[PDB]
Amino acid sequence: AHIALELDKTKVKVGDVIVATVKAKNMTSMAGIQVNIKYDPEVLQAIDPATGKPFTKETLLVDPELLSNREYNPLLTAVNDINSGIINYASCYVYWDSYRESGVSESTGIIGKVGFKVLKAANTTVKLEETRFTPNSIDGTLVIDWYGQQIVGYKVIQPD
């Protein structure tokens, strides 16, 4: 069981597009997630990978695979801090009762994507990390189960 952050490109130059992708594997019972992706605003700017629209405070992660089934009522939210380089995205079903009794666990899959148009040639860091939004976290990740209790003991993998 782990949450991973994958970048499809590691070392490139200015004006290029880096798709960061938040992913979960074997997160059994997961009914909801909150992640924090910390970046440097001076070196990198947050954008939508499909159209190229910049990220504001209310902007969600692109193209969720997990926690998106309308049967179980997804409640998506984002309170990002672009000024201080934080993506704060939360997603969380309401109808847990049905989700657990269906006999399907949303364990492995994509949480969401975020584009990153590069501004400077100097090298920087991109990772899942604690903020003011996520106290009592595992490397800037909170995860609940279909009973509402916080899941603990999964690993959080960063990119290179």
Structural domain that includes position 35:
1-160
Q: At 159, which amino acid appears? A: P
Solved by what technique? Answer: X-ray
Cβ of 147: how many Cβ atoms within 10 Å? 9
Indicate the helix (H) or strand (E) that contains 101: helix 96-101
- Spell 91-106 as b/e; 16+ CB within 10 A means b: bbbeebeebbeeeebb
Distances, alpha carbon 103 to alpha carbons 27, 71, 87, 106, 146, in Å:
15, 14, 32, 10, 12
Cβ of 156: how many Cβ atoms within 10 Å? 17
Q: Which of 46, 30, 49 is nearest to 90 (CA)?
A: 30
Q: Which of 25, 33, 21 is nearest to 107 (CA)?
A: 25
Resolution of this model in Å is 3.0
Cβ of 67: how many Cβ atoms within 10 Å? 23
The CATH code of the domain that includes 111 is 2.60.40.680
Q: In what order do the strands lie in the sheet with 2-7?
A: 44-47, 109-118, 17-25, 2-7, 155-157
| Number of domains forming the structure of the chain | 1
Q: Which of 134, 132, 157, 109 is nearest to 7 (CA)?
A: 157
Tokens 């924090």 identify what position? 36
Contact 24, 109 (CB under 8 A): yes
DSSP secondary structure letter of residue 72: G
DSSP secondary structure letter of residue 143: E
